[PDB]
């Protein structure tokens, strides 16, 4: 029995996400076709011209794909499953220069370097400054009375986390934030004029100058650990540091922003969870917010060989698309997946991906950012109330909120 979906439905269609999350449609796949061939008409594959892909909807299959990175490649077609239909193949392949789109052994070496400086100690060293910034953000928003929660609450702390991790001078954070924002959303009419390639090139140029500067003056950041040779002489070259900065700018900005916006949307819809949060301030809330928000709807892989997955024969060369938005509501893993429960524990969501080689290196920085901003929201605008419905982002793989009008003082 085929799944009850409209003919030609494409779960990476940006026109869907501009209006809604296809929650009923994912639930139908989980019940009737948990691994399902998503066909794509000629020229309508978002930059891929292979006839379609396997939709992966169950959490255990997402973990299996993610852990078998020897078979399911990030490099072969990159991990973003949807671009503009007319994107040039060369513009997909240039994305192989960021760690996200690399396979072992190249990925292994680069991740080892990135992780010697990107440690729990390094992240914890940002706690106090990000806490001060979160309190300032929430106080200034509340002072405004009403406004766009996305812009006045959600946007700034994730960017300041990237700046503090890298030790970016305060005078440069404006342009750093500009470049980061220019590298996502280009399929939405509101952002039709951004140029992510041009922005990435400007950020690489900036980052390579940073690498040369911070080599002369080591400072209390991660850059020095990254650009300094270890025992084996392993280190990021200046251009590798540049591609890492591009990586961070695109990985840790709008993802965390959208988790914050949709976290507060969830609190607005579940007042009892908001009351509980304000009283207990449970840090388990961050993981339930990421599960609920699933800011990356999906990443893909490409089979390097034939592989049988939960009884379905994946063929060499075929793409599999891991729908984290479906897996995070998998009835076989979660008790009451469609209950927003900030005390959920353990919370084995895959909002940060399936376990394995590419697991989000910023997961704990993201959780800390979320916990700090929601404490600040609780401290300064405990009675906020939405004014109008969120405006969603036209994207085929990112779950974004562009704007959300709220009354911070609660009438």
Residues 223-282 that bind ligand HEM (CB under 6 A): 247-248, 251-252, 255-256, 259
CB of 85 to Cl ion, least distance (A): 4
Q: Does 250 bind ligand 2QC (CB under 6 A)?
A: yes
Nearer to ligand HEM, 273 or 328 (CB): 328
Residues 351-370 that bind ligand 2QC (CB under 6 A): 360
- Number of Cα atoms under 13 Å in the Cβ half of residue 319: 29
155 marked among binding-site residues: no
360 marked among binding-site residues: yes
CB of 340 to ligand 2QC, least distance (A): 22
Buried b (16+ CB within 10 A) or exposed e, 392-403: bbbbbbbbbbbb
Note whether 257 and 150 are within 8 A (CB). Answer: yes
For ligand 2QC (CB under 6 A), the number of binding residues is: 10
- Of positions 53, 179, 329, 334, contacts Cl ion by CB under 5 A: 334
Residue 62's SS3 state is helix
Q: How far, in Å, CA of 151 to CA of 373, rounded?
A: 13
Distances (CA, A) of 322 to 17, 90, 112: 16, 24, 25
Residue 48's SS3 state is coil
- Contact of residue 184 among ligand HEM, Cl ion, ligand 2QC, none (CB under 5-8 Å per partner type): ligand 2QC
Beta strands per DSSP E along 274-368:
298-303, 307-309, 312-314, 319-323
For ligand HEM (CB under 6 A), the number of binding residues is: 28
Nearer to Cl ion, 190 or 332 (CB): 332
Q: Which two tokens stand for residue 63?
A: 């973990």
Residues 283-302 that bind ligand HEM (CB under 6 A): 290, 295-296, 299
- Count of other CB atoms within 10 angstroms of residue 286: 25
Q: How far, in Å, CA of 33 to CA of 238, rounded?
A: 47
- Contact of residue 365 among ligand HEM, Cl ion, ligand 2QC, none (CB under 5-8 Å per partner type): ligand HEM
Q: How far, in Å, CA of 178 to CA of 163, rounded?
A: 12
Nearest residue to 182 via CA among 163, 166, 159: 159
In the complex, which residues of this chain contact ligand HEM (CB under 6 A)? 66, 99-100, 111, 162, 247-248, 251-252, 255-256, 259, 290, 295-296, 299, 351-354, 356, 358-362, 365-366
Task: List interacting residues with ligand 2QC (CB under 6 A).
Answer: 80, 100, 183-184, 250-252, 255, 296, 360
Known binding positions: 185, 360
Q: What residues form the annotated binding site for heme?
A: 360
């Amino acid at each position: 029995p085929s799944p009850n979906l409209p003919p030609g439905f494409d779960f990476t269609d940006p026109a869907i996400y501009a209006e809604r999350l296809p929650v009923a449609e994912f639930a139908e796949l989980r019940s009737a076709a948990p691994i399902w061939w998503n066909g794509q008409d000629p020229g309508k594959g978002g930059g891929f011209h292979d006839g379609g892909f396997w939709a992966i909807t169950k959490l255990n299959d997402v973990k299996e794909i993610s852990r078998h990175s020897d078979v399911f490649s990030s490099y072969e077609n990159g991990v973003i499953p949807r671009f503009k239909n007319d994107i040039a193949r060369e513009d997909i392949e240039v994305q192989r220069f960021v760690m996200l789109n690399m396979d072992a052994p190249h990925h292994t070496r680069l991740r080892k370097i990135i992780s010697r400086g990107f440690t729990p100690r390094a992240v914890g060293r940002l706690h106090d400054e990000l806490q001060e910034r979160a309190q300032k953000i929430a106080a200034e928003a509340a002072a405004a009375g009403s406004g766009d929660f996305v812009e006045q609450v959600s946007c700034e702390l994730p960017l300041q986390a990237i700046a503090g991790l890298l030790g970016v001078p305060q005078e440069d954070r404006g342009k750093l934030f500009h470049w980061s924002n220019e590298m996502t959303g280009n399929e939405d009419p509101e952002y039709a004029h951004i140029d992510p390639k041009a922005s990435s090139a400007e950020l690489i140029g900036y980052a390579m100058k940073m690498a040369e500067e911070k080599a002369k003056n080591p400072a209390d950041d991660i850059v020095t650990q990254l650009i300094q040779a270890d025992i084996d002489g392993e280190k990021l070259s200046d251009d590798e540091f540049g591609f890492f900065v591009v990586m961070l700018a695109v990985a840790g900005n709008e993802t965390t922003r959208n988790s914050i916006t949709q976290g507060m949307m969830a609190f607005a819809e579940h007042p009892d969870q908001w009351e509980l949060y304000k009283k207990v301030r449970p840090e388990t809330a961050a993981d339930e917010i990421v599960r609920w928000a699933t800011p990356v709807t999906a990443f893909q892989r490409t089979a390097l060989r034939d592989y049988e997955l939960s009884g379905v024969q994946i063929k060499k060369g075929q793409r599999v698309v891991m729908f984290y938005r479906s897996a995070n509501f998998d009835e076989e893993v979660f008790q009451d997946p469609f209950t927003f429960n900030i005390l959920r524990n353990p919370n084995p969501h895959v909002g940060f991906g399936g376990t394995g080689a590419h697991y989000c290196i910023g997961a704990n920085l993201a959780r800390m950012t979320i916990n700090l901003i929601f404490n600040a929201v609780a401290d300064h605008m405990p009675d906020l109330k939405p004014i109008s419905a969120p405006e969603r982002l036209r994207s085929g793989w990112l779950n974004g909120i562009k704007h959300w009008q709220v009354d911070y003082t609660g009438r």
